[PDB]
Design an enzyme around this catalytic site. Structure first.
Site, mmCIF file in Angstrom:
data_model
loop_
_atom_site.group_PDB
_atom_site.id
_atom_site.type_symbol
_atom_site.label_atom_id
_atom_site.label_comp_id
_atom_site.label_asym_id
_atom_site.label_seq_id
_atom_site.Cartn_x
_atom_site.Cartn_y
_atom_site.Cartn_z
ATOM 1 N N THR A 77 -10.862 -13.724 -4.343
ATOM 2 C CA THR A 77 -9.561 -13.953 -5.002
ATOM 3 C C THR A 77 -8.556 -14.819 -4.736
ATOM 4 O O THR A 77 -7.499 -14.967 -5.032
ATOM 5 C CB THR A 77 -9.078 -12.430 -4.696
ATOM 6 O OG1 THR A 77 -9.002 -11.980 -3.232
ATOM 7 C CG2 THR A 77 -9.864 -11.288 -5.347
ATOM 8 N N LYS B 223 -4.634 5.182 12.677
ATOM 9 C CA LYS B 223 -5.532 3.918 12.693
ATOM 10 C C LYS B 223 -4.734 3.093 14.013
ATOM 11 O O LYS B 223 -5.638 2.312 14.722
ATOM 12 C CB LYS B 223 -5.121 3.229 11.419
ATOM 13 C CG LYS B 223 -5.922 3.265 10.250
ATOM 14 C CD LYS B 223 -5.571 2.702 9.088
ATOM 15 C CE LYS B 223 -6.245 3.666 7.760
ATOM 16 N NZ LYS B 223 -7.623 3.262 8.033
ATOM 17 N N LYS C 240 4.811 5.801 13.830
ATOM 18 C CA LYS C 240 5.238 6.855 12.793
ATOM 19 C C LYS C 240 6.493 7.011 12.358
ATOM 20 O O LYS C 240 6.674 7.690 11.305
ATOM 21 C CB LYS C 240 4.344 8.292 12.930
ATOM 22 C CG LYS C 240 4.376 9.214 11.961
ATOM 23 C CD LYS C 240 3.484 10.307 12.103
ATOM 24 C CE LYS C 240 3.114 11.016 10.623
ATOM 25 N NZ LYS C 240 4.525 11.489 10.065
ATOM 26 N N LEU D 242 8.870 4.906 11.878
ATOM 27 C CA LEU D 242 9.415 3.910 10.941
ATOM 28 C C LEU D 242 9.098 4.085 9.395
ATOM 29 O O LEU D 242 8.015 4.773 9.180
ATOM 30 C CB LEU D 242 8.706 2.455 11.392
ATOM 31 C CG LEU D 242 9.109 2.142 12.905
ATOM 32 C CD1 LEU D 242 7.929 0.848 13.218
ATOM 33 C CD2 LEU D 242 10.565 1.989 13.153
ATOM 34 N N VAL E 219 5.422 4.121 7.574
ATOM 35 C CA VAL E 219 4.251 4.390 8.517
ATOM 36 C C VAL E 219 4.148 5.900 8.479
ATOM 37 O O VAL E 219 5.138 6.646 8.884
ATOM 38 C CB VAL E 219 4.740 3.905 10.156
ATOM 39 C CG1 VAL E 219 3.525 4.252 10.759
ATOM 40 C CG2 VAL E 219 4.714 2.288 9.885
ATOM 41 N N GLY F 152 6.082 -22.878 -0.085
ATOM 42 C CA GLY F 152 4.630 -22.464 -0.530
ATOM 43 C C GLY F 152 4.531 -23.157 -1.788
ATOM 44 O O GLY F 152 3.375 -23.527 -2.271
ATOM 45 N N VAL G 61 -9.018 -17.699 -4.755
ATOM 46 C CA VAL G 61 -9.047 -18.756 -5.759
ATOM 47 C C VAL G 61 -7.791 -18.472 -6.829
ATOM 48 O O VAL G 61 -7.919 -17.179 -7.261
ATOM 49 C CB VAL G 61 -10.255 -18.943 -6.281
ATOM 50 C CG1 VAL G 61 -10.208 -19.790 -7.630
ATOM 51 C CG2 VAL G 61 -11.339 -19.702 -5.479
#
Ligand SMILES: *P(=O)(O)OC[C@@H]1O[C@H](n2ccc(N)nc2=O)CS1
Ligand code: NA
Ligand code: NA
Ligand code: NA
Ligand code: NA
Ligand code: NA
Length: 317
Positions: free
Chosen positions: A93, A64, A52, A54, A57, A181, A95
């Site tokens: 998604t 969580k 928290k 950071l 966050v 990529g 695709v």
DNA sequence: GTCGG
DNA sequence: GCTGATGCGC
DNA sequence: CCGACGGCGCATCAGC
């Protein structure tokens, strides 16, 4: 750099459901910001409160993290991963061309898998068919070696259409990265300026289709082309994957701003952007005033004419 | 969901 | 047929 | 408390 990977996977997993299923793009970016600040954190996180601290966050991500650390899971993720509807929407998604909205519509109509997509070519548009067709290839990284070969072809054919074009392959590739990529190419020509397209983009695209480098077109207009390409392989070698390639016609006097911008990194850009009284966009650099009123944009003949103005190489970035 | 006016 | 809005990728 | 959170080119849809 994998010290909180369970935490980081979780958060990216949550991120994608917000984007693709809930359609909450700001929550998506919130989870991603949180994931990457945590990914760069040099210690193994032991509590949500430690995290928290950071920036990006907050209280709910910290809760969580506490549940995840106590149990190795997140009830909400476990649950949503079982959900047939939502899993399917999330997956589709992947695709290219299927966004959150198309995904939901398909799943509403019972189209949930690639097979389902295959059985219904007709319900997809052009981009979507090309994304289906190359679904596996597009998720693959491109080794540097192959990018060099792809670069060889691009420069050769660009120069061949007209020797006065200038083309630069930007992205991680230009930063020396070991893989990429896709391929982002910036194209300019001395007869294209802010006040000037005479088929400059088109005739380049056409040449690369002519030598069978470009194999498909996702979209193509006067300044931006998006498509697919592939290296030739010899008589008895397995084919290279099909690859994503974008080509941008930019005017001569904005080239280097464009170059810098699409050179990245995304991290270094947003960074040096805010970092003095100058504002930068992909096109230009403008000086401010009192309110912060952008004046006229300043001339540029190189990348390094910009490293004048903030008193501020791609290898590094 | 997190930040900050 | 044309204009503007939305979806999408990045 | 409550709004900002990125913007732009192209394809395609909704509306007139
Ligand atoms: P692509 O994944 O090839 O990214 C390269 C260039 O960076 C810019 N960029 C990246 C991501 C997002 N969300 N937005 C964006 O403008 C332009 S393309
Ligand atoms: Na929603
Ligand atoms: Na914080
Ligand atoms: Na997609
Ligand atoms: Na890229
Ligand atoms: Na990429």
């Amino acid at each position: 750099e994998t010290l909180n990977g369970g935490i980081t996977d979780m958060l990216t997993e949550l991120a994608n459901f917000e984007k693709n299923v809930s359609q909450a793009i700001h929550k998506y970016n919130a989870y991603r910001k949180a994931a990457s600040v945590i990914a760069k954190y040099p210690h193994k996180i032991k509590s949500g409160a430690e995290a928290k601290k950071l920036p990006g966050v907050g209280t709910k991500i910290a809760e969580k993290i506490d549940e995840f650390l106590a149990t190795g899971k997140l009830r909400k993720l476990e649950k949503i991963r079982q959900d047939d509807t939502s899993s399917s929407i999330n997956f589709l998604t992947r695709v290219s061309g299927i966004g959150p909205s198309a995904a939901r519509k398909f799943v509403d109509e019972g189209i949930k898998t690639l097979e389902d997509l295959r059985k219904n070519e007709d319900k997809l548009n052009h981009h979507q068919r090309i994304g289906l067709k190359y679904f596996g290839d597009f998720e693959k990284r491109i080794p540097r070696e192959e990018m060099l070969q792809m670069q060889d072809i691009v420069l050769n054919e660009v120069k061949k259409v007209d020797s006065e074009y200038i083309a630069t392959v930007c992205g991680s590739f230009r930063r020396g990265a070991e893989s990429s990529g896709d391929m982002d190419v910036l194209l300019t020509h001395p007869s294209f300026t802010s006040e000037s397209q005479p088929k400059l983009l088109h005739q380049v695209v056409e040449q690369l289709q002519k030598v069978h480098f470009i194999t498909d077109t996702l979209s193509k207009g006067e300044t931006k082309f998006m498509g697919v390409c592939q290296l030739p392989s010899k008589n008895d070698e397995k084919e290279y994957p099909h690859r994503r390639i974008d080509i941008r016609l930019i005017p001569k006097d904005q080239y280097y701003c464009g170059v810098l911008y699409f050179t990245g990194s995304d991290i270094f850009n947003k960074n040096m952007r805010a970092h003095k009284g100058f504002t930068i966009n992909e096109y230009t650099i403008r000086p401010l005033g009192v309110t912060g009123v952008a004046g006229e944009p300043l001339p540029v003949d190189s990348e390094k004419d910009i490293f004048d103005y903030i008193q501020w190489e791609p290898k590094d970035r």
